[PDB]
Paper text:
We later discovered that H. pylori encodes an atypical species‐specific bifunctional dehydrogenase/isomerase enzyme FabX, which introduces a cis‐double bond to the saturated acyl substrate of ACP via a backtracking mechanism that expectedly reverses the conventional fatty acid elongation direction. FabX utilizes a nitronate monooxygenase (NMO) flavoprotein family conserved flavin mononucleotide (FMN) cofactor and an active residue His182 inside the catalytic tunnel to extract electrons/protons from the acyl substrate for dehydrogenation and cis‐double bond formation, storing the captured electrons in FMN and [4Fe‐4S] cluster cofactors, respectively. Subsequently, FabX transfers the stored electrons back to the oxygen molecule located in the oxyanion hole between FMN and His182, generating superoxide (ROS), which is further excreted by H. pylori as a major source of peroxide, likely enabling its pathogenic function of gastric mucosa corrosion. Here, it is demonstrated that FabX is essential for H. pylori growth and gastric colonization by retaining UFA synthesis and producing ROS, respectively, and is a species‐specific anti‐H. pylori drug target.
Subsequently, we examined the enzymatic activities of these compounds and found that 8p (annotated as FBX‐1991, hereinafter) exhibited an outstanding inhibitory activity against FabX with an IC 50 value of 0.158 ± 0.030 × 10−6 m in vitro, and increased the stability of FabX by ≈18.2 °C (ΔTm) at a concentration of 50 × 10−6 m. In contrast, it does not inhibit the enzymatic activities of the structurally conserved homolog FabK, the functionally conserved homolog FabI and the conventional UFA synthase FabA at compound concentrations of up to 10 × 10−6 m compound concentration, indicating a high selectivity of FBX‐1991 against FabX. To elucidate the inhibition mechanism of FBX‐1991 against FabX, we determined the X‐ray crystal structure of FabX in complex with FBX‐1991 in space group P21 at a resolution of 2.00 Å resolution. Subsequent structural analysis indicated that FBX‐1991 binds in the region between the FMN cofactor and the catalytic tunnel of FabX surrounded by α10, α14‐α16, β3‐β6, β9, and β10, and inserts its 2,4‐dichlorophenyl group into the catalytic tunnel, pointing towards the bottom of the tunnel near the [4Fe‐4S] cluster. In the structure of FabX–FBX‐1991 complex, FBX‐1991 is stabilized in the catalytic tunnel predominantly through hydrophobic interactions. The methyl benzoate of FBX‐1991 (A moiety) interacts with the isoalloxazine ring of FMN via π–π interactions. Meanwhile, the carboxyl group of the methyl benzoate group forms an H‐bond with the sidechain of Arg280 located at the N‐terminus of FabX β10 strand, which further stabilizes the methyl benzoate in the correct position.
Residue numbers in the entry: -1 to 177, 193 to 363
Write the structure that this text describes.
């Protein structure tokens, strides 16, 4: 009862994935070895989030903890944890391709990119910024494919021109994620068109893609593939186990845009530390992990009421009262929790 897929394999750099589908990276601790390993086993691109890896297995692999938080960027972005996450994912998926997702705004971005390459990533995905120096840190890892997340055709042109002038290389792909002209059905064609100036770089559409109908819409607009996160957030294999319990009663009213210490908006569930901020009992802010450069070691966290490293870390640890919980706008459509296998079958059959 599942017709062979008519979707065709997607080549990114030297890497081929069976289905033109990325499971979007999700931190902290949402897309680690069980999720990304099982996604890649099923033939989509599993993506490991490289942010906050110091939290992995309750801070098993860090060198220093202060106040139950990984101490500084070197422990918050823990190379030893990252190595173990990748190794555990490949116990599930073998040599099927795996990405690492690294936000450009993090402190020590270049170290974490090199760490991801050494951990065995085949692909690096980077948004939250304009990542003009991505290949600077990968010179030892030429065959690792490099993919910026962009929200405009202008960004593609600036990136191709700056990479080409400095590295004589251009990106292997672009993920287009909107932040009426920022509607994905308008944005993707504009980016695909602009890409032709540089040699038809595959374009991956992301944001609000729920089912095969959405996938086919994006493909027919010139996208080479899609990236989906919220659907995989509703799988059993999600490494942050709170979401399987929280999502099936989530109502659309409980999803809101919030400011963040990174200087970009996030979409959050009105629960955990978000609820603590309205009640006035939220935790004190005291920058320990120094997670992102735009925060200025607590300046913006104090302004928006929460520390995103602490809050996302607490969610991975199962903390319902003070954790920070993210969702795409479609999160209210998660009515059951299903397996990654069953999800991939629903997205690819026919
Ligand atoms: C819980 C959660 C965590 C996320 N974390 C990251 C992240 O660490 N890095 C990143 O580039 N995008 C992150 N995103 C965005 C997703 O990777 C993805 O591009 C977007 O949510 C796709 O839209 P969809 O959820 O409608 O499919 C996150 C999204 C969610 C819901
Ligand atoms: C369709 O898209 C959505 O609805 C959606 C919903 C939620 C988040 C995102 N994007 S995001 O990259 O996660 C992000 C955006 C703004 C501020 N912060 C982060 N992330 C982050 C920062 C620091 C650390 Cl330490 C860890 C992480 Cl995960 C997108
Ligand atoms: S205070 Fe700011 S920089 Fe420090 S860990 Fe929290 S969000 Fe990151
Ligand atoms: Mg529902």
């Amino acid at each position: 009862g599942s017709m062979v897929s008519t979707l065709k394999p997607l080549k990114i750099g030297k890497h081929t994935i069976k289905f033109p589908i990325f499971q979007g990276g999700m931190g902290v601790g949402i897309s680690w070895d069980e999720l990304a390993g099982n996604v890649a086993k099923e033939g989509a691109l599993g993506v490991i989030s490289a942010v906050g890896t110091g939290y992995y297995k309750n801070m098993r692999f860090v060198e220093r903890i202060v106040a139950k938080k990984p101490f500084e960027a070197l422990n918050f972005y823990s190379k030893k944890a990252l190595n173990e996450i990748f190794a555990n994912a490949r116990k599930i998926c073998g040599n099927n391709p795996l990405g690492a997702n690294i936000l450009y705004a993090i402190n020590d971005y270049g170290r974490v990119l090199r760490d991801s390459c050494e951990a065995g990533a085949n692909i690096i995905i980077t948004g939250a910024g304009l990542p003009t120096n991505m290949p600077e840190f990968a010179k030892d890892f030429s065959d690792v494919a490099l993919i910026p997340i962009i929200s405009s055709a202008k960004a593609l042109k600036i990136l191709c021109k700056r990479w080409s002038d400095r590295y004589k290389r251009i990106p292997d792909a672009f993920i287009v994620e909107g932040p009426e002209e920022f509607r994905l059905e308008n944005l993707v064609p504009k980016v695909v068109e602009a890409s032709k100036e540089w040699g038809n770089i595959p374009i991956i559409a992301a944001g609000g893609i729920w089912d095969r109908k959405d996938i086919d819409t994006m493909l027919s607009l010139g996208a080479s593939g899609v990236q989906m996160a919220t659907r995989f957030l509703g799988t059993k294999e999600c490494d942050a186990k709170v979401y399987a319990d929280l999502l099936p009663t989530l109502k659309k009213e409980d999803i809101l845009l919030i400011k963040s210490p990174v200087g970009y908006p996030a979409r959050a569930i009105n629960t955990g530390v978000i609820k603590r901020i309205e009640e006035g009992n939220a935790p004190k802010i005291a920058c320990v992990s120094n997670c992102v450069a735009p925060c200025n070691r607590g300046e913006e966290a104090k302004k928006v009421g929460y520390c995103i490293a602490d809050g996302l870390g607490r969610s991975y640890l199962g903390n319902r009262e003070e954790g920070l919980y993210f969702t795409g706008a479609n999160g209210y459509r998660v009515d059951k929790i299903i397996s990654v296998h069953e999800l991939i079958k629903e997205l690819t059959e026919g």
